[PDB]
Subunit: 336 residues, 2 copies
């Protein structure tokens, strides 16, 4: 019956809005909820547990009112405001990339490295990993534990909702213009997205990979705490609204059969396994779900010790909001 004051910073964004919904759905022990944003968003209303909560300016907010803050207002605002909330004694769970690679801040997937949460005392900050990494690592954890992983080839099928509402509107807007004869203009993306696949998520790096691809690499090795897992991504934007899917081709360190992995995955909490000719898809199975979906599990015929799988999740939920709320749950349970 111990209750906590909770702030959500970025309350008017898809993830901030979903964090509220997930807090409500998972019946988090909240005494008071504060909703924070910039000045323009100030005065907007949302319902939490039956009561209207008003969005207030972060500039005017007294951080001492709060035990835990869930941040999802973009990297700039997290860099600016997280140290301030943390200085005030608030534990920040940060859904941006900003603190992920900072040497002493933990990067947590609760199904994977929940021990790392203990390192919240270093800076009063816990980093929430990238959506693609979260879902891949949840699916691969059982395999990693049983037999180890030497190398991951992964290609992604990423929805436009990763580029926020500017991406969603570009998809829906381009698609209507094209269908009704009008030309489609590009702004959020460098090429047309409607009825197209763009093999670029974020800017390029010196090595040919993009930042999104480089994030799956670095965040994987940090989270598994293993600088010897090799990760080889190609990240692609696809004309899908919500959910990300991944084709994962892994090389294990010891041999294991698809039947064993399927049994493990089925027994692991947070994983829904689809067998045989059934498999999850973004539109059909992923939308609105808090867990990770897998199918197409099979032995790699090209390698002595390989496993192939197909991984799907809702990138706004498990890929962000829900992962953060799950960190919060374990934080209050074991540290408060």
């Amino acid at each position: 019956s111990q209750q906590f004051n909770v702030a959500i910073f970025g309350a008017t964004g898809a993830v901030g809005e979903t964090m509220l919904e997930v807090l409500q759905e998972r019946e988090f022990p909240v005494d008071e909820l504060f909703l924070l944003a910039s000045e323009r968003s100030e005065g907007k209303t949302y319902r939490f547990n039956g009561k209207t909560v008003r969005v207030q300016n972060v500039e005017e907010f007294d951080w001492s009112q709060v035990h835990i803050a869930l941040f999802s207002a973009g990297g700039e605002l997290s860099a600016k405001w997280a140290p301030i909330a943390a200085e005030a004694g608030v534990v920040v769970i940060d859904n941006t990339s900003h603190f992920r690679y900072d040497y002493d801040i933990p990067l947590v997937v609760p199904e994977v490295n929940p021990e790392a949460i203990a390192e919240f005392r270093n800076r009063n900050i816990i980093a929430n990993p990238n959506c693609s990494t979260i879902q891949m690592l949840v699916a691969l954890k059982p395999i990693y534990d049983a037999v180890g992983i030497e190398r991951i080839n992964v290609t992604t099928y990423q929805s436009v909702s990763g580029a926020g509402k500017a991406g969603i509107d570009e998809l829906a807007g381009q698609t209507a213009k094209l269908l009704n004869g009008y030309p489609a203009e590009t702004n959020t993306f460098s090429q047309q997205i409607a009825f197209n696949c763009i093999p670029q998520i974020d800017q390029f790096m010196d090595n040919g990979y993009t930042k999104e691809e480089m994030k799956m690499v670095w965040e994987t090795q940090k989270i598994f705490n293993d600088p010897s897992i090799m990760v080889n991504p190609t990240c692609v934007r696809v004309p899908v609204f919500y959910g990300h899917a991944e084709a994962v081709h892994v090389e294990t360190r010891a041999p294991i059969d698809a039947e064993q992995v399927m049994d493990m995955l089925e027994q692991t909490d947070g994983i829904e396994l689809f067998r045989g000719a059934d498999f999850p898809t973004q539109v059909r199975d992923a939308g609105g779900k808090d867990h990770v979906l897998v199918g197409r599990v099979r032995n790699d015929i090209s390698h002595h010790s390989g496993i192939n799988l197909w991984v799907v999740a809702d990138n706004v939920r498990k890929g962000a909001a829900t992962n953060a709320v799950q960190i919060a749950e374990l934080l209050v349970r074991d540290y408060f």
Copy 2:
């Protein structure tokens, strides 16, 4: 200036219509062109080299009128009609999967194994390979010749046109209905395709891979004439109309840098290499092209001798009709 009589069986399908256009565009030495189909689709006319050509019933066709036949009417009709055309002295180039794995029938990519065409004399039949395989092998051939290839990881981004006009109608259909509030009806694919990705093309095999996936394995091995090249595909249907893309992660037998592979490909005819922050996509670069497009060429950071690339082509053109017309060119040049 020697001219040949050419038949197209399956003249009213997208590939058969494209075969006609390609024969014209490439100025193939045709004397008479015959267009063949069923009884239902007949009396229809097409323009070819400024002449009007009438579609006739295959059942009533005298095959002795023709030197070469291009087949794209489906596997069942090829099994029926190809042996008939062959016994009459016609050389059949078959764009179906039916004959591709017959030991006595050559499976040909003219950029890759042009010498196999000689095997046409076994049964008067040459097989045209799968579209996804064609574009992959054109891209990998120069790498294969330089340093060899031990293993390929590939995942595909495959357009609905791979499923004929039924697939196109289903995509254009569902997309319209959903943007106007009506539910999606799935009549063709195993799941909704509009705004979705489906990690299944063709029937599931007992090893867990789909037939499309096994084609990429077996046809690659046959065409490179190498049972030791390991191929690991995941084939995914995407909400795109024309062109196939592939994310290709190859392991070479000797180290090679991305700078050398890029130089080779750019110097290879039939390949358009995209450097830097430029890359080909389906909608923007693939549609209407007869060649293979590649970008994102970069060293694989996860492996000592790995190269990653992005490969795109028009599946109806270089992935079908164009490849078939290129076989026919070498056939008349070197064997007639």
